[PDB]
Design a protein around this motif. Structure first.
Motif, short mmCIF file in Angstrom:
data_model
loop_
_atom_site.label_atom_id
_atom_site.label_comp_id
_atom_site.label_asym_id
_atom_site.label_seq_id
_atom_site.Cartn_x
_atom_site.Cartn_y
_atom_site.Cartn_z
N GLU A 4 29.50 119.56 -19.76
CA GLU A 4 29.62 118.01 -19.14
C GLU A 4 30.66 117.63 -20.64
O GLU A 4 31.32 117.01 -20.30
CB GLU A 4 29.25 117.75 -18.21
N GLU A 5 29.21 117.13 -21.55
CA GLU A 5 30.50 116.15 -22.27
C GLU A 5 31.04 116.49 -23.07
O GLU A 5 31.05 115.76 -23.72
CB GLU A 5 28.31 115.78 -23.02
N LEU A 6 31.08 118.14 -23.19
CA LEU A 6 32.14 118.48 -24.26
C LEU A 6 33.87 117.16 -23.57
O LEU A 6 34.67 118.56 -24.28
CB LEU A 6 32.54 119.92 -23.98
N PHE A 7 34.07 117.43 -22.18
CA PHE A 7 35.31 116.89 -21.36
C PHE A 7 35.63 115.52 -21.33
O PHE A 7 36.07 114.89 -20.29
CB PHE A 7 34.96 117.68 -19.83
N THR A 8 34.05 114.87 -22.11
CA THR A 8 34.18 113.36 -21.83
C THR A 8 36.18 112.11 -22.61
O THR A 8 36.46 111.55 -22.02
CB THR A 8 33.52 112.11 -22.26
N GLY A 9 36.45 113.41 -23.69
CA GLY A 9 38.09 112.57 -23.89
C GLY A 9 39.11 113.40 -23.65
O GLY A 9 38.95 114.72 -23.11
N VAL A 10 40.06 113.37 -24.50
CA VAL A 10 41.11 114.40 -24.70
C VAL A 10 40.62 115.42 -25.11
O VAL A 10 40.36 115.71 -26.30
CB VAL A 10 42.70 113.67 -24.77
N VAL A 11 40.70 117.16 -25.00
CA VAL A 11 40.71 117.51 -24.98
C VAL A 11 42.07 118.53 -25.93
O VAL A 11 42.71 118.96 -25.04
CB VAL A 11 39.23 118.66 -24.43
N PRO A 12 42.25 119.46 -26.85
CA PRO A 12 43.68 120.08 -27.21
C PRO A 12 43.31 121.01 -26.43
O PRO A 12 42.32 122.30 -26.20
CB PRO A 12 43.69 119.66 -28.96
N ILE A 13 44.14 122.13 -26.46
CA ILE A 13 44.75 123.46 -25.57
C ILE A 13 45.58 123.86 -25.91
O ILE A 13 46.63 124.18 -26.54
CB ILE A 13 44.95 122.88 -23.86
N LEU A 14 45.05 125.90 -26.26
CA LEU A 14 45.69 125.95 -26.81
C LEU A 14 45.77 127.72 -25.78
O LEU A 14 44.42 128.50 -26.01
CB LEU A 14 44.35 126.72 -28.23
N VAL A 15 47.20 128.25 -25.77
CA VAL A 15 46.78 129.17 -24.79
C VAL A 15 47.73 130.52 -25.04
O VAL A 15 49.18 130.64 -25.88
CB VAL A 15 47.73 129.15 -23.47
N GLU A 16 47.71 131.81 -24.90
CA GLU A 16 48.07 133.20 -25.79
C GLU A 16 47.85 133.54 -24.42
O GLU A 16 47.02 133.89 -24.27
CB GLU A 16 46.82 133.57 -26.79
N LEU A 17 49.01 134.76 -24.03
CA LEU A 17 48.99 136.06 -23.11
C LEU A 17 50.36 137.33 -24.03
O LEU A 17 51.15 136.57 -24.40
CB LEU A 17 49.77 135.04 -21.91
N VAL A 64 43.07 126.66 -16.21
CA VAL A 64 41.82 126.57 -17.32
C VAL A 64 41.19 124.76 -16.57
O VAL A 64 41.48 124.16 -16.41
CB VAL A 64 42.52 125.85 -18.88
N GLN A 65 40.29 125.93 -15.55
CA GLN A 65 40.09 125.56 -14.38
C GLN A 65 38.78 123.53 -14.93
O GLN A 65 38.49 123.59 -14.11
CB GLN A 65 40.11 125.84 -13.35
N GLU A 111 37.26 126.96 -29.26
CA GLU A 111 37.23 128.00 -30.87
C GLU A 111 37.10 125.92 -31.18
O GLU A 111 38.34 125.39 -32.06
CB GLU A 111 38.24 128.25 -31.39
N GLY A 112 36.07 125.66 -32.15
CA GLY A 112 35.66 124.38 -32.47
C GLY A 112 36.50 123.72 -31.70
O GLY A 112 35.48 123.35 -31.01
N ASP A 113 36.87 122.35 -31.75
CA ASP A 113 37.15 121.67 -31.02
C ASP A 113 38.34 121.81 -30.07
O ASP A 113 39.07 121.06 -29.41
CB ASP A 113 36.89 119.87 -31.47
N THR A 114 38.73 122.97 -30.14
CA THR A 114 40.36 123.30 -29.30
C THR A 114 39.98 124.03 -28.01
O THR A 114 38.96 125.71 -28.13
CB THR A 114 41.52 124.20 -29.72
N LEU A 115 40.24 123.81 -27.21
CA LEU A 115 40.15 124.98 -25.28
C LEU A 115 41.11 126.05 -25.58
O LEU A 115 41.52 125.31 -25.31
CB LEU A 115 40.02 124.23 -24.58
N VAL A 116 40.04 127.68 -25.79
CA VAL A 116 41.44 128.35 -26.24
C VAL A 116 41.50 129.49 -24.59
O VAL A 116 40.07 129.33 -24.41
CB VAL A 116 41.03 128.90 -27.22
#
Length: 225
Positions: A4-17, A64-65, A111-116
């Motif tokens: 929960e604490e990992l989502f308190t701010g703006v989190v960068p996202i990277l999508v690979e398909l 990325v629900q 991966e680090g502070d990027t949600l992949v």
């Protein structure tokens, strides 16, 4: 909760398909950020292999629900965030009514502070002249309710919902979604009581972008309790 604490701010996202639909192989990369405090997502996707062989709207649910906003009184039911940062596997079969189906498998983790979100998609049995391969879908998107329920034996959740894609002639193309999410770590996760996520999305285009692409703004909030 744990993550929960990992989502308190703006989190960068990277999508690979990586996808393959009726023999056409393609890849999509996406970047943006998510702000779970407001249930907000802003992302831009690009088809890096050229022209996308299927309509962008058909890929929205897949691309990325954990960024859904959960009201304070429903925090105990946020499975998605509770599985971080080790992550979860998300699988689906998407059945396009009177047409083909997508089968997808993805891992969403930090991966680090990027949600992949790394996804493999295989599309089979599509009609060459159906609404999907025939690109007959309007470039827009409707609001939907996504139903979630716990799957205790699998220590995960099952999700199901129906997407309504507007077709150019005014009709509709239904896409039934069956989804299963399981944790990647061995740690504990929050298993929810039944509830749903209410979702709204708006699709747009970057006037300066020459590659095939889609810009997406999305709001998702949990409800039903």
């Amino acid at each position: 909760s744990k993550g929960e604490e990992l989502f308190t701010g703006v989190v960068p996202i990277l999508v690979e398909l990586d996808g393959d639909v009726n023999g056409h192989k393609f890849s999509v990369s996406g970047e943006g950020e998510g702000d779970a405090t407001y249930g907000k997502l802003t992302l831009k996707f690009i088809c890096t292999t050229g022209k996308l062989p299927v309509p962008w709207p058909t890929l929205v649910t897949t691309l990325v629900q954990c960024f859904s906003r959960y009201p304070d009184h429903m925090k105990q039911h946020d499975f998605f965030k509770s599985a971080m940062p080790e992550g979860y596997v998300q699988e689906r079969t998407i059945f396009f009514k009177d047409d083909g189906n997508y089968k997808t498998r993805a891992e969403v983790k930090f991966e680090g502070d990027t949600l992949v979100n790394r996804i493999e998609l295989k599309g089979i049995d599509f009609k060459e002249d159906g609404n999907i391969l025939g690109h007959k879908l309007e470039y827009n998107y409707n609001s939907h309710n996504v139903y979630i329920m716990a799957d205790k034996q699998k220590n995960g959740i099952k999700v199901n919902f129906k997407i309504r894609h507007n077709i150019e002639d005014g009709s509709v193309q239904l896409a039934d979604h069956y989804q299963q999410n399981t944790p990647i770590g061995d740690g504990p996760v929050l298993l929810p009581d039944n509830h749903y996520l209410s979702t709204q999305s708006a699709l747009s285009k970057d006037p300066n972008e020459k590659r095939d692409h889609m810009v997406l703004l999305e709001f998702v909030t949990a409800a039903g309790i």
